[PDB]
Each structure stands twice: as C-alpha cells, then as structure tokens.
Amino acid sequence: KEMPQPKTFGELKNLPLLNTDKPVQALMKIADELGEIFKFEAPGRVTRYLSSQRLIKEACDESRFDKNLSQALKFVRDFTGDGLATSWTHEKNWKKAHNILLPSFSQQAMKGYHAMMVDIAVQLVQKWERLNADEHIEVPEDMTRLTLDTIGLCGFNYRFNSFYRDQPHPFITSMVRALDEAMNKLQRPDDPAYDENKRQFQEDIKVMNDLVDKIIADRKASGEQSDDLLTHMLNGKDPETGEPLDDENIRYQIITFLLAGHEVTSGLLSFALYFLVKNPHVLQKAAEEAARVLVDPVPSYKQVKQLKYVGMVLNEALRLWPTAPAFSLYAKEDTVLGGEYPLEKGDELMVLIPQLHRDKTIWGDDVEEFRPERFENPSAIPQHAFKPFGNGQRACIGQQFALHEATLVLGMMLKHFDFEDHTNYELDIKETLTLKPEGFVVKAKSKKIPL
Amino acid sequence: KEMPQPKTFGELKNLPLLNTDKPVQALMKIADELGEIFKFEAPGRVTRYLSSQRLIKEACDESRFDKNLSQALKFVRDFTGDGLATSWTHEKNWKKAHNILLPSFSQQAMKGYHAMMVDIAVQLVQKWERLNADEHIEVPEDMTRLTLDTIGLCGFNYRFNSFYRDQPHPFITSMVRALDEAMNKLQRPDDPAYDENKRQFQEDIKVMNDLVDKIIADRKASGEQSDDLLTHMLNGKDPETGEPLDDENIRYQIITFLLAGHEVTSGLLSFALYFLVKNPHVLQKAAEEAARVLVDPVPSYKQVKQLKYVGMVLNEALRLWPTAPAFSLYAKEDTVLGGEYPLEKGDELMVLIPQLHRDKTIWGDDVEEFRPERFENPSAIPQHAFKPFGNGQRACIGQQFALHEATLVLGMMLKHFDFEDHTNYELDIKETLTLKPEGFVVKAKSKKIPL
Ligand code: HEM
Ligand code: HEM
Ligand SMILES: O=C(CCCCCn1ccnc1)N[C@@H](Cc1ccccc1)C(=O)O
Ligand SMILES: O=C(CCCCCn1ccnc1)N[C@@H](Cc1ccccc1)C(=O)O
Ligand SMILES: Cc1ccc(O)cc1
Ligand SMILES: Cc1ccc(O)cc1
Ligand SMILES: Cc1ccc(O)cc1
C-alpha cells in the first residue's frame, strides 16, 4: 500500500537523484534498495518506477495503461515532434504513421533492407580487417558508425559514410547535441545561464529540420523510388484515414529513425560484444554459430535468421542492458496496480527495463550473469518479463530492423574476427537517453576469411 | 556422402535390428560402429539416425527441420492423440495447447506445484524411512510411484496413492500396456497373431479415455479450481486463437502428461540415483549440497533451485541415459545435412540422444564417466550438444516440472539417506519407449533427519 520513495532534496524532492551521469543505473540501484516499485517525485511531477514483472505485466496491460511520454521523451519531442516514438497513442499521427510504417518494419521488410545492411556491415568488417596489429577497435563508436549508416541507408538511401569520418555528419552533431540538451534538461531551474543551451537547442532543431526537410524535398523532386522508409512514407497511405503522412511528420519519423538506429541499436551491439568478450564460452559458441551459418562471403537474410545463438546473445545483452532502458505509461483510468498500489487516471509509471530484466522471481538467482541460453527457448520467457522493445502497440517498431542489423553484424563480426578484450575493459555505462559501454575497446584478430 | 547403413535382412531391410528388447542401445551400438549418421530402413520407412552434435545441431535448426512423429510416437498417438507430444507442429491443437499450457509449465508455475511435489516426495522419504533393516529399495519402482503421483497430484489433483499400492492404478495398467503394445508394434505387423494385441490395445485406449474423460467431466461438474493443469486447461484460452482446448484434447494432454510423468521422469531419478551410487564422490558432493541447502524439514521451492549440483547430477544422468532417448525430425525443405548428406523435403531424422550425449568431440574422451561438473556452465556446452528434452518449440514442455520434481526428490533423498549399492547392481537398461535401470536396487540407511 505505502509506496517506497528514495531520498529527497527538500523542495526538489527526488529530482537531484537524476542529476547524475548514469540516472538509469542510479534508478536501478534505487530499485535494488526499494524493490519492485517506488515513487519518484520531482517538482510538479510524480512517477512510479516499476521493476518487477509482477507489476510490469499489469502496466503492460494496454486496456489499463497507455504509453506516456516521459519527461525525456517530451524533451526529445521538441525535435522528434509527433514521430512514432514521441507521439501519444491518441494523436492522429501515431496510428497513422504506425499503420503506414508497420509494413516497412516487418520481418518481411528486412529481406528488402538486408542488402543495404550488409553493405554497411561489410564496411565495418573491412574497417576492422584493415586495422594494424595492436590497433584496437572503439566498439560503441564503430557500432554507432554501423547503425547510423545502416538506418541512413535503409531508411533514406543516404550514406552517412561514417566509416569515412572521424567528425560526425552535421545532422548527427545537431541530433546528438539536441539529445544531450534534452537529457541535460532532465537533470536541471531554467536560469538565464541556459540561454546558450536553449539557442543551441533551437539551432540544432533547425539544423535537423532543415537537413531532413531537404532530404524529403530532394526525394519528392526526384521521384526516385527506392526500397527505403522515405519512399514508403512518401507513398504510403494509412488504410484507416486513407491519408499519407505529411512532410512534417515524415521529417519527425526520419529524425526519430536516425535517433533510434544512431545510438540505441549500436548500444545493443556494443553491449553484446562486451558480454561476448567477457564470456569467452559464449563468444565461442556464438562464433561457432557464425562460422557454421555464415558460409557465404556476404550473409544472406536467411542465414541471418539462422543465427539463433547470436540472437540469444543479443537478447541476453538486451536483458542485462536494454539500451532504451525505460518506458513510461499512464493509467488510462483509476486502477489498482498489483492489488496494492491504487493509481488515479493519468498517473505515470516508469518501466525500469534493466530492473525488470533482473527480476530474480522471473530469471532465477543468476540475473547478472550473461547467459544467452536463458533465451534458448523463447517460450520459456514469461509474458512481459523481457521488454527491451517496450510494450504492445507502442512497442519498438524497429525491433526487427534492430535485431536483424545486430544479428547480421554481430554474426559477421564473429565470423571474421577473434576478439581480445585486451584492456580487461571495466564496464562503464554511459547514459544519454540510451546506454552504451563507454570506452569499450577490443582488439580484433582477423580470421582472414575474405568477403 | 554415402550414408552408412547397418546390416539388412533382405526385404525387411533393417527392421529386424529393432526386434530386440533394447532397441535404443542397439541403435547406439550401431551408431558406435557406423558413426554420426546411418540410414535405417524399414519396409516403407526410411530414417536417418543422427548421433553427432555436428549433425544434430543442424537437425535442431527449426527453420529446416520440424518435429516428426517417429513410428513410436505415431503408435503412441493412438492413445495420446493430438496431445502436445504427439501432435504435429502444424496441428491447430499443438500451438493452442502449447500456448495454453506453457505458463503452467514454467519455472514460475513450479512454485505453485512445489507443495504437491513435496507431498509426494515426503511420501517417498517416509516410505524409505519406514523400511526395515536390510529391506532394499526398488529404485525405478519407487521413482515411478513418486513421479506418477507427482504428475497426478500437480497434474489433475488426483492421488494415484502409488505408495499405498503394489497393483498399479487401472489407468496405468492400460497406459503401460498400451505403451508396451505401441513399442511391440515397432519390433513387429498385420499378422493374425497380433489381433489379441489390437483388442487389448483398444480396450486400453478405451480405459484411458473413459477414466480421463471422467476426470475431466468430474472436474467440470465440480466447478472447483485447483492450482493444476486440468484447471488451466479447462479455463485457459489460447492467446492466439482465443480458443480453449476442447475436452478431447484435454484428455490427450492429461494422458500425455501421465505418460510423461510416469517412467520418463522416474527414469531420470532412477538413472541419477544409479549414477550417484556408482560414483560415491559425486554422491557425497550431491549429499553435501543437499545437507547444506535443505536446511528445513520440507524443501522450499527456493531451496530446490539452490540444489545446483543436484541439478547437474540430473543433467549428467540425462546426458548418459536420456530417458526419452530419441526424437524425430523431418526436413521442412530440401536441404543438405552436414554439407554432405542431401535430404529431400520430408526426409526423416532420428536424433539418437544417448549417442549425441556421447559425442567425444563435445564431451571429451571420458564421455562415459558420470561428471555432473560437465554441467557447471551451460554456456560452455556447445549448441545442441545436450538434448535430453528435445528441441526448440517442440522441446519438452514438462522439462522444468521434471527437473524440479527430480531435484526436489533427489535432494531430499540425498539429505535423508545414505545409499548403498548393496547388490553391486549391474546396469540393465530396460527399454519401453523410455529407459530405466531395471532391477536397480539400493539400501538406504536413514540419516535420521526428521521431516
Ligand atoms: C536495439 C535497438 C532498439 C531498442 C532496444 C529499442 C527500444 C525501443 C523501446 C523500449 C521502445 C518503446 C519506447 C517507449 O515505450 O517509450 C521503442 C519504440 C520505438 N522504436 Fe525502438 N529500439 C531500438 C531500435 C530501434 C530502431 C533501429 C528503430 C528504427 C529506425 C526504432 C524505432 C522505434 C520507434 C519509431 C518507436 C516508437 C514506436 C511507436 O510507439 O509507434 N527503434 N523502441
Ligand atoms: C526427465 C523427464 C523428461 C524427459 C527426459 C522428457 C523428454 C522429452 C523430449 C525428449 C521431448 C521431445 C520429444 C520429441 O521431440 O518427440 C519431450 C516433449 C514433451 N514432454 Fe517431456 N520429458 C520429461 C518429462 C516430462 C514431464 C514431467 C512432462 C509433463 C507432465 C512432459 C511433457 C512433455 C510434452 C507435453 C511434450 C511435448 C512438447 C511439445 O511438443 O509441445 N515431459 N519431452
Ligand atoms: O530514463 C527516463 C526515461 C528514458 C527515455 C528512453 C528513451 N527512448 C525511448 C525509446 N528509445 C529511447 N527517465 C525519466 C526521468 C524523470 C523522472 C521524473 C522527473 C523527471 C525525469 C523521465 O524522462 O521522465
Ligand atoms: O526409438 C525410437 C523412437 C523414440 C521414442 C521417444 C518417445 N518419447 C518422446 C518423448 N517422450 C517419450 N525409434 C524409431 C524406431 C523405428 C525406426 C524405423 C522404423 C520403425 C521404427 C521410431 O519409432 O520410428
Ligand atoms: C537521411 C538523412 C540524410 C541526410 C541528412 O542531412 C538528414 C537525414
Ligand atoms: C536517444 C533516443 C531517444 C529516443 C529514441 O526513440 C531513440 C533514441
Ligand atoms: C488421470 C486419472 C485419474 C484417476 C483415474 O481413476 C483415472 C485416470
């Protein structure tokens, strides 16, 4: 009945707890101390952090809870607008874009994206093939180069050419800096000091809008039909409204897609590789599978589908460190959560996914151990125990994309290189709105298998 | 390229090889002579027995091979119908029952079964506590009493009261005799000599149907809810189709669960205790773990989960003598196995699990030794090297049930008794469709620890 709540800071309530480099890990530690649910209060903001599958399975009841825009998502909405990830379910653009875009994110659509993913994955492999002896790989950096490029190419037939760059593309510079500002506002009063941050945020928004609007305009002017999200958005009609997305919503979708693919997915790859190199038996098993399945110089889609163990590795990395580590819900009506936490309509819930995923009640005592075999049989996973991609109709639309990309790339990585955690890397999880293993570096020794 | 095949008997091809009381062990011996794959042909039947992890890891690829009903299972289907174990994957009832029953077989459902499992386990312990000096235990017999009672009680809140009986329950008489008939049909086929076997087989099918249908009817008449499989099947709706199991399929599930819970699971316990008394250091280590963990008169669910070594003991017993020793696959499409055995769509494979489990390339030279420590790390076990519970979505739904039951009981056995292999029992594996150490007897000297 009485809900735990972490330490408060007077009028700031719990808000300063989020004034940390790693708010998600701080929230995890709080959930470790306080259990499956705790109230988190900020000035004019109350939410309840859920950590147990028991409570989260209820929160995932879409008849009782709907996606809430967390404060983080509201700030990202300043540049992703009413894009799929930052639109309310009841907003007309959400269902509309959802209906229009769902087919181009299907498992079937991955067949069409596969060749472009391979293109970038090959650049990644070639990059690593081309390292000198005892040069290392900056994993999240290269994974991000890969994932950004992949979504650039698959989504908008645009080549960020991240493997040809140290300095990020002007769109990314703004996106990252807009994200950094969005995150920083969470930790933050809006004293005059932030006028530079505010101007910069608006400049970055204008930058992203301008570049993405140009890409949309450029495509419309060409008429060039490609196998990409932009083409599908320019032509797709929502069966329900019969309408296409307007160009502004397309822009927000593109920004959203770049945001999702640019970091969130690379985090999965980085964590996966981190866990692989920390768990040599797992790596060996994933590498065996990579070697057994990826028998052609270029993986086919079907071969990627056969990378079962690689997929388990990915799920197990998603279990430990889901890179979009939280999502937010609101009670559609007065309701009682877990039979003992009465919620009023509009009350907010935060699903603290890494805690969910450490629910010992679901996963057993060994929750911190990296064991892809937990995912050997996907039906052994209870409902709503494993929610790296969120929940229900507001679940990650890019799930199949992210997983296909990640499986392909990790499969190729495992095919082509032995990996050395030559620094005995100490997991240091950097938090933006997503998670990455900061400074994670490996050496890759080529297995000399040509492409 | 050319696939070995054991000796043939003219028109009967290999069929007479199965006309032996130990066909699995005979198939293992053939696999020892012929290696990882051999064609096994009967009139109008061809299958390929796989014995190497190299090939079985391919066989376990669900995008290439689906569960096949072996001839044994097809004969078992005559009384287990489209129960989960004898339904084809494409059978509406398989997915439906699978979706419906999966939660009642999860690790979380074991928590709710645990008390009834303890109930039977305590009856087992008390039976042994109550033996007179120099009164031995008929191990498989008592394990079967335990396992059958356990599935009767957790499965349908029915007390077979097997520890009160010399004479098996009429359901069991018919089930055992139907099993023996199914197996005999393999070794056999339409000659008049077997017409009494048919009448008996149908009488036994009728008995099982009637008795189980009455259990279903009585439950539906009662309205009473138990924390049991029958209740879940009467009330559960497949999330996918929204449909419940019908009463006939529930009957097939019950019979299947009873068959699974009778002899298959007791075989595990019997083999485990066999190996334990044959490997006294292992027994001592398992016994040390039971004493350290089972600190209460009655094991809790959590304590059974802490019986890690006992779990390994069970896995190692499953490695050597998987009590469901084979499963059958068919090629969903034309495919090449192991890069050198072309298979046409619909070609059948038998996974000879005990031979798989002896793959020295996986387990090392000492494959015959009982070393539960081989199971210390699942990640260290190559993919599909260890398949005592079958594979993929058609894997044993009762796996967690069996293991929890077996761990609980074995832990308690190890807690409560010292065991003497007082006859220096010579392993003699009786084959029905499952394997048991026939005549395996031990003496148990109580450690006099109360319950
Ligand atoms: C491993 C990578 C990813 C993870 C772990 C992940 C996770 C998630 C999560 C947890 C949600 C729900 C967020 C919420 O409820 O507030 C979500 C939604 C979404 N994701 Fe991802 N995501 C990933 C990759 C991607 C990619 C690659 C794309 C597309 C380029 C994408 C696009 C989306 C979109 C558009 C939504 C909003 C869906 C809707 O509400 O209609 N994501 N994602
Ligand atoms: C140590 C004991 C057990 C072992 C070694 C075992 C083994 C297996 C194997 C090897 C399969 C796959 C068979 C095939 O592919 O044709 C299977 C399936 C099955 N088992 Fe078990 N089993 C055991 C105990 C149990 C128990 C206690 C139950 C439930 C009471 C159970 C119920 C089933 C069912 C219903 C299936 C069919 C699953 C499906 O295909 O959807 N088993 N088992
Ligand atoms: O971590 C979060 C949400 C994380 C966003 C995930 C971003 N994503 C979504 C889809 N792919 C990535 N935290 C809370 C923190 C807070 C609580 C109370 C008051 C102020 C802030 C919030 O934003 O509301
Ligand atoms: O051992 C077997 C079947 C395996 C029994 C497993 C029973 N189980 C499964 C899950 N829980 C118990 N062998 C072959 C024998 C055969 C080959 C060719 C022609 C005729 C017969 C078969 O039945 O097809
Ligand atoms: C897809 C894309 C390409 C360029 C750019 O500047 C923005 C978005
Ligand atoms: C960082 C981030 C934020 C939102 C989103 O949908 C993806 C990534
Ligand atoms: C499953 C069952 C239970 C009782 C009985 O009499 C027959 C069958």
From Swiss-Prot, chains A, B:
Its main location: cytoplasm. One of its GO terms (molecular function) is oxidoreductase activity, acting on paired donors, with incorporation or reduction of molecular oxygen, reduced flavin or flavoprotein as one donor, and incorporation of one atom of oxygen. The record marks V264 as: Important for catalytic activity. Changing F389H: High substrate-free turnover rate constant. Negligible substrate-induced spin-state and substrate-induced heme reduction-potential shifts on addition of saturating concentrations of arachidonate. It is found in: Cytoplasm. One of its GO terms (cellular component) is cytosol. Residues 1-451 are annotated as: Cytochrome P450. Changing L84E: Ineffective covalent modification of the heme macrocycle. Extensive formation of Fe(II)CO complex in the substrate-free form. It comes from the Bacteria. Changing A260M: No effective fatty acid oxidation. No effect on electron transport from NADPH to FMN. Slightly lower high-spin conversion with arachidonate, palmitoleate, palmitate, myristate and laurate/dodecanoate. Keywords: Cytoplasm, Electron transport, FAD, Flavoprotein, FMN, Heme, Iron, Metal-binding, Monooxygenase, Multifunctional enzyme, NADP, Oxidoreductase, Transport. Induction: By pentobarbital. Expression is negatively regulated by repressor bm3R1 at the transcriptional level. Heme binds at C396. (9Z)-hexadecenoate binds at Y49. This protein is a target of protein engineering. Its selectivity-directing and activity-enhancing mutations have been extensively studied and the designed mutations allow this enzyme to act on non-native substrates and/or in order to enhance production of synthetically desirable end-products. In the N-terminal section; belongs to the cytochrome P450 family. Functions as a fatty acid monooxygenase. Catalyzes hydroxylation of fatty acids at omega-1, omega-2 and omega-3 positions. Shows activity toward medium and long-chain fatty acids, with optimum chain lengths of 12, 14 and 16 carbons (lauric, myristic, and palmitic acids). Able to metabolize some of these primary metabolites to secondary and tertiary products. Marginal activity towards short chain lengths of 8-10 carbons. Hydroxylates highly branched fatty acids, which play an essential role in membrane fluidity regulation. This is Bifunctional cytochrome P450/NADPH--P450 reductase. The lineage of its organism: Bacteria, Bacillati, Bacillota, Bacilli, Bacillales. The chain holds residues 4 to 456 of 1049 of the full protein.
